[model samples]
Target: PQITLWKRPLVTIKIGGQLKEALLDTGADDTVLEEMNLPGRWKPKMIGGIGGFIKVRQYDQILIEICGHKAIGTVLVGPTPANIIGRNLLTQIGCTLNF
Candidate 1:
C-alpha cells in the first residue's frame, strides 16, 4: 500500500489473535512490541535504539499479521514507547519506501 510520510505510518496488526496498532519503522531492524504476556519461552536480549540500549525478551517463531499480510519471525517484548513493525517483518510484507 502507498503511505504518505506526512503523518505517522501506523497500521493495525494482529499477533497471537490480538489486534494492535504499530508503526511501520523502516529504520528499525527488529520488530518490538510493548511489554505483554506471551506464551512459550523467551530469551533475554539487549537492543540499542536512538537513546540507548534496553533489555528485552525475545520470542522466536511468532506469527503476526500486518495489514493482512502474514509474517512469522522473532518478536521482542520490551518497554518501547510504541509498537514497531521493523524491516524484519516489513520485508516479509513486501513493504518498501518510495519517493
Candidate 2:
C-alpha cells in the first residue's frame, strides 16, 4: 500500500477523448507537457527547479486532464522527461495537488 502524497491520484489530462497520468508537483511553478505526446519538437533549456536550477524545455499545447478536469496551455516540458501538474493550472481550479 502507498500513503505518500506523491502517490495521490494524478490529475487527468484528456486529449482526443483519451486520458493520461500527470503527477502533481507544487515544487514546479508551472504546468508541464510531455514532449512524447506533444504536437511538435521541443528544444530543452536551462530552468529553475525546487532544489535548484534544472533543465527544461518548451513545446506546443495539447489537451490536458487533471483530477477529472481538463484544459489546454503551453505546458512545461521536463528535460529528463515526465509530466508535471503545475500551479498555473491548479490555481485555476482553486485546489493544490497533494504532492
Candidate 3:
C-alpha cells in the first residue's frame, strides 16, 4: 500500500491478540510499545532515543500483524512517547519511503 506523509504514518496493528495503533517511524531502529503485560520472560535492556537512553523489557519472537501483514521480531516495552513500528518490523512488512 502506498502511503502519503501528509500526516503521521499511523496504522492499526494487532499484537498479542489485541488491537492497537502505532506509528510507522522510519527514524526508529527498533520497535517500542507502551508499557504492557506480556507473557513469557523478557530481558531488561536499555535503548537510546532522541533524548536519552531508557530502560525497557525486551520480548523476542513476538508476532505482530501490521496492517494485516504478519511480522515476528523483538518488541520493547517501555515508557515510550508512542507505539512505534521501526525498521526492524518495517523491513519484514516490505515498507519503503518513496518520494
Candidate 4:
C-alpha cells in the first residue's frame, strides 16, 4: 500500500500497550514516545530536536506496531511534543520515496 507524505505524516501506532498517534518523521533517527511507565530498566540519554534537548529513557528491543506491521527496536520515552516513528522503525516496514 502507498502512503502519502503529508506536511505531517501522522499515523496511529501502538506502543507501551497503548494506541497513540505518531508522526512519520523521516528526519528523526530513532522512535520517540511520550512518557509512560514501561517494564524493564532503561538508560537515560539526552535527545535534542524542535525545541531543545531533553532527558529521555532509552529502552531497547521494544515492540511497536504501525498499521498492523510489527517492529522491534529502540524507543525513547520522555516529554516529547509528539510521538515519532523514525527511520529505525519505518525501514522495518520497507518505506521508500519514489519520484
Per-residue lDDT for 1-99 in model 4, tens only? 577765677888888789988888778888889878777899999988767898899899899889778899998999888888888998998887776
Model 1 pairs in collision: none
After superposition, the stretches of candidate 4 with alpha carbons farther than 4 Å from their true spots are none
- Order candidates by lDDT, high to low: 3, 1, 4, 2
Per-residue lDDT value at 65 in model 2 = 58
lDDT of 1: 0.91
* lDDT for model 4: 0.86
Q: Which stretches of candidate 2 lie over 4 Å from their true place?
A: 1-6, 16-18, 40-45, 50-54, 96-99
Q: lDDT for every model? A: 0.91, 0.62, 0.92, 0.86
Residue-level lDDT of model 2, residues 1-99, one tens digit each, is 122563554655665455667767667677665555557677766666556776667655655656666566656665545667777776665664344
> Model 4: what TM-score?
0.90
What's the TM-score of each model vs. the native? 0.95, 0.60, 0.95, 0.90
Estimate the overall C-alpha local distance difference test score of candidate 3: 0.92
Which ranges of candidate 1 are over 4 A from the true structure?
Answer: none
- Per-residue error for 12 in candidate 2, Å, reads 2.8
List RMSD in Å for every model shown: 0.9, 4.8, 0.9, 1.3
Model 2 lDDT, residue 51, Cα: 65
lDDT of 3 at 48: 93
